[PDB]
């Protein structure tokens, strides 16, 4: 079905590095150069106040829409990823349901400026205070902290490509039917990532990477906060939240 569902040679691992990096470059939503250039474009005190005065539900809807747009690029990344389309549909959905948000959270560190603790949102950079109307301060602060920690690693685009491919191809996801096929694909993607680190003298980041339960904790907190919001504004979720967002985070 795919070469990467079996043991791969060094030459095949080298090809996998290139393939993953190409798939990422074609699906990365925003260019790193564009994000870096925009660092000087910061929301004014008046703009921040405007976001803070928005209703909780208007702010949740805006953020759900932005997250859904980012997730759509992750779905395209998955489709272009060696071996992914050779998995069964059940397993493709299991992997995307569990991993799409995790991939977005990792990608987000490119849009986060560690110098002033701001994130690119709706055309400009703003601090965590921009999200005060959401009423999930702990989750927002946890996401900013995570982006800060990833930013300290100074990831290259290729490192993000390989790391996010691994976040997605996780054979430990509950519900996988063809677990052994996923395990082999994961092993080869682990080799590709570690090969690239070895070749670029970046193996020192391995001990500095987030622990696996960190991404899981952020995703669990997001689903919990959505459930609290849904109790407060159920018709907002039913009428105005993106269908893909509901399919992933509120069982449809």
């Amino acid at each position: 079905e795919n070469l990467y569902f079996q043991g791969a040679s060094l030459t095949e691992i080298e090809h996998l590095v290139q393939s993953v990096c190409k798939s990422y470059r074609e699906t990365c939503q925003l260019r790193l150069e564009d994000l870096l250039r925009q660092r000087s474009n910061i929301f004014s005190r008046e703009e921040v106040t405007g976001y803070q005065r928005k209703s909780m539900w208007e702010m949740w809807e805006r953020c759900a829409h932005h997250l859904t747009e980012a997730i759509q690029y992750v779905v395209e990344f998955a489709k272009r990823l060696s071996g992914f389309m050779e998995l069964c549909q059940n397993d493709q959905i299991v992997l995307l349901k569990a991993g799409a948000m995790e991939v977005v959270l990792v990608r987000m560190c490119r849009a986060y400026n560690a110098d002033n603790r701001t994130v690119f949102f709706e055309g400009k950079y703003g601090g965590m205070e921009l999200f005060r109307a959401l009423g999930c301060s702990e989750l927002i602060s946890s996401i900013f902290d995570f982006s800060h920690s990833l930013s300290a690693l100074h990831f290259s685009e290729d490192e993000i490509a390989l790391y996010t491919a691994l976040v997605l191809i996780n054979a430990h996801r509950p519900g996988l039917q063809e677990k052994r096929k996923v395990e082999q694909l994961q092993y080869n993607l682990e080799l590709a990532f570690h090969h690239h680190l070895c070749k670029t003298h970046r193996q020192s980041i391995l001990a500095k990477l987030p622990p696996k339960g960190k991404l899981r904790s952020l995703c669990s907190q997001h689903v919990e906060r959505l459930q609290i919001f849904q109790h407060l504004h159920p018709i907002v979720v039913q009428a105005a939240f993106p269908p893909l967002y509901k399919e992933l985070f509120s069982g449809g």
């Binding site: 759509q72 779905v75 489709k79 549909q89 493709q92 959905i93 995307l96 349901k97 269908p243 893909l244 399919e247 992933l248 449809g252």
Partner: peptide, 12 residues
């Protein structure tokens, strides 16, 4: 139901 993911995965 998985209405959107199935469609995105099937669209080439």
């Amino acid at each position: 139901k998985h209405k959107i993911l199935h469609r995105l995965l099937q669209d080439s």
